[PDB]
């Protein structure tokens, strides 16, 4: 359910921007109709989607380049294991531990600032 909460917060947030770029759109052109003007939006938002996308392209090549490092691996790829599971989990129980460090790390850091403010 929990998981289901973030999903709606995402659908929330989104129908809200789309209601609306849909609203920068009707009624703007509704005016037009009578005679007014709404538009250099777009230019805003159009260049906004560009900027949006600009990064998504980088994400694509990042993933692409991972795939082949991965395949690349898969090629090396080819041989038994219970011990390793253990070896993994004793490592995760270390990794979580330094990460916690850092988080308290930060957390206390914030706390310090917050203290300084008042």
């Amino acid at each position: 359910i929990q998981r289901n909460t973030l999903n709606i917060d995402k659908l929330k947030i989104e129908t809200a921007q789309e209601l609306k770029n849909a609203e920068i759109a009707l009624r703007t052109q509704k005016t037009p109709p009578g005679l007014q003007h709404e538009y250099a939006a777009p230019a805003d938002y159009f260049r906004i989607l560009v900027q949006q996308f600009e990064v998504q392209l980088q994400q694509y090549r990042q993933q692409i380049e991972e795939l082949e490092n991965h395949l690349a691996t898969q090629a090396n790829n080819s041989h038994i294991t219970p011990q390793d599971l253990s070896m993994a989990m004793q490592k995760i129980y270390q990794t979580f531990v330094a990460l916690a460090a850092q988080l308290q790390s930060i957390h206390e850091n914030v706390k310090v600032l917050k203290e300084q403010y008042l």
Binding site: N4, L19, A22, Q29, P33, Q74, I92, Q102, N109, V110
Partner: protein, 136 residues
């Protein structure tokens, strides 16, 4: 000793149902935003075929429109590509141990990777915050 657990079971169960209800009716309504915002993107199909008809009774030509038509295809195109990339990744994942996909093994490797990914964030969102503190 068991009865007590039973209690905070009852508890927390009907607060789960307060949950779902809610999220339930939520989904209706996010859903209704989707029936309205749709009828009326058009009836925005007036207001836009009017402009058209009107614009046609004009001198003529249309222009500098193509660029946009290019922009939308251009914006659209990669969307095409993300799908393909998705269509690859799944195949790669599929290539992986036989005689039993339904075992626990892969279960543990999936879940575990989920953990590893989440841990990653926690890392430098933390490091962020840790990073960020310097200005102060």
């Amino acid at each position: 000793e068991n009865g007590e657990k039973i209690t905070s079971l009852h508890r927390e169960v009907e607060k789960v149902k307060l949950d779902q209800k809610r999220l339930d009716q939520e989904l209706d309504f996010i859903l209704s935003q989707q029936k309205e915002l749709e009828d009326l993107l058009s009836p925005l199909e007036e207001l836009v075929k009017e402009q058209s008809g009107t614009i046609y009774l004009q001198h003529a030509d249309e222009e500098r429109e193509k660029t946009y038509k290019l922009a939308e295809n251009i914006d659209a195109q990669l969307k095409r590509m993300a799908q393909d990339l998705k269509d690859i990744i799944e195949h790669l994942n599929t290539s992986g141990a036989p005689a039993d996909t339904s075992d626990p093994l892969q279960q543990i490797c999936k879940i575990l990777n989920a953990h590893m990914d989440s841990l990653q964030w926690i890392d430098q969102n933390s490091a962020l915050l840790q990073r960020k503190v310097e200005e102060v």
